[PDB]
Amino acid sequence: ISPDGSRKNPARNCRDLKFCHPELKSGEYWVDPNQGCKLDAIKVFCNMETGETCISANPLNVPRKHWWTDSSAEKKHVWFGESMDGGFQFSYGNPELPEDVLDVQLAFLRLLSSRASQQITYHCKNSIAYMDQASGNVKKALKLMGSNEGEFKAEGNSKFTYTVLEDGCTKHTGEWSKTVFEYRTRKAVRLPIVDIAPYDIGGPDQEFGVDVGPVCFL
């Protein structure tokens, strides 16, 4: 028999579980990309239609706040995790496992998957996330930091551009909205996303939140 994705019998990943157990529906399973001992398995969502292994961020969100003050009114990319007070870089997999173990489990998926993708949602109050309505351009768009020392941007090297799935942040309305970003690649080493650098921030009324989506490997 071939492991069925339970904690006692984790599969290698969700693709293997799909291949060997095509009866199983999308949901929560345990996978062990590094094989060997079963005890360091990680808990994931398996999309059984696509075969994707999806690992949630912990924590899932960055609360909505006035995170950055720069009263010189200068606008500049500022990394949330690297530079902001209360800042953290994004983390993935079972919080009860050692960080080193999670890093290796992710490394197996990042290095040896055919592709990967991840969405991230920026919650905005008076903060352009991508397009600025006044200008019609994306010069004020935020950046994302990948996992292979690379950045995902609105423009530039086309191998490194994200795409925007919706964009409700184009004007300062004094209200809350959101923009959803996605990076999709055949070089899964570049994922997951570990940081975000908003540009249109620093003013007294400028605020943001973040919902970090699961990194999904095929």
Next chain:
Amino acid sequence: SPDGSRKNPARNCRDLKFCHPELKSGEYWVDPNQGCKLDAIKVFCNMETGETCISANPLNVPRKHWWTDKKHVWFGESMDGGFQFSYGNPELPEDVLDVQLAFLRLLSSRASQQITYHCKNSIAYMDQASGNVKKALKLMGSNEGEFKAEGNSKFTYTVLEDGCTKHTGEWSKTVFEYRTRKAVRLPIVDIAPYDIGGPDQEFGVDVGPVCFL
């Protein structure tokens, strides 16, 4: 331990040699990504060297007047009926094959592949009349890197025989090899001849298997 049959695949040919030194060179089933046995691939194992050799699909580019019109032209990216070379059991989904290859490419000590260019009135490497390799074809590897007659010596191919040096109205062939300790660079996925586009100028290609150690 695994015997290399379809129902019991070995991780790769090197393991199969190690664990069964009595087995002889031939067709076996290997499963580099391990885990579930069902996505195993069919390969040739050289049991003298331990190499895992995966055949291209399809095996070859048939001989013809492929191109009309001097510069490198990618067969797969730019020619009519052009296609890139792929590898592994065609009944398996492409993402699954990518993964099986990735395991071999990332984690082998070395890899090699031969390509044979069949030529009629087409220089492949050396031009006998000029005495240079400026008209030499190019190859496409798997990390978007090119293999060439010259340049960075980490990305140059070698030539094992060269019968394509003159236009003679007859058919001949030149055999190219890329060999590397950085196996992510292989397999070869496209070829760009240079000395083509004339009426009389025809070519074919035999794509050798990518062999991992």
Next chain:
Amino acid sequence: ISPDGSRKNPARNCRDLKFCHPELKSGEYWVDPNQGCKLDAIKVFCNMETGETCISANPLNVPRKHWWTDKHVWFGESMDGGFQFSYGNPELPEDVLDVQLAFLRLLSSRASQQITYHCKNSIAYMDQASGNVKKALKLMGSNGEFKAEGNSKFTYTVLEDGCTKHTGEWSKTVFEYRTRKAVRLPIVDIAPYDIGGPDQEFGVDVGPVCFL
């Protein structure tokens, strides 16, 4: 029959063994990073406190000799009776050890290695007479050089430096390179600068390459 680190039942690596048998103490174990066939397992030292997998050099040491007679000079490449350092069971073929090491890197977030330079009238790191490091030795990594200065990503750190002065006596300097990019290890060669007068001599203890 959960893998136990014996030759017949090797674990994948030291952390894997620690995870499956956390009562086990540090010492020598058989691990098999590439899995599949158990017969190409490698004998390693498992630090069971940290979970590190440590592979010894073979040979362990360069003996104390007047190695060079009158530039940085590579021990393995240029010196009479010199050799590059190698890792893993010598009775396993090189291509197989290469594979085991490739897997060990994948199973690792980070790696480290120490190397001890035994010196007589041979500056290793700091030169007392000049207050500077210009004469400091260099190490050859896998894939890449480790140096006293230059790019930060590639600088080693020094743990003791007793080689600062020509004293006529034997002393030693301890080097360490640590990185997330485990492809850069292990160390394969060593390049001392301050050699060799008739007086000048050295030896080396290559410490295990350690993966976590």
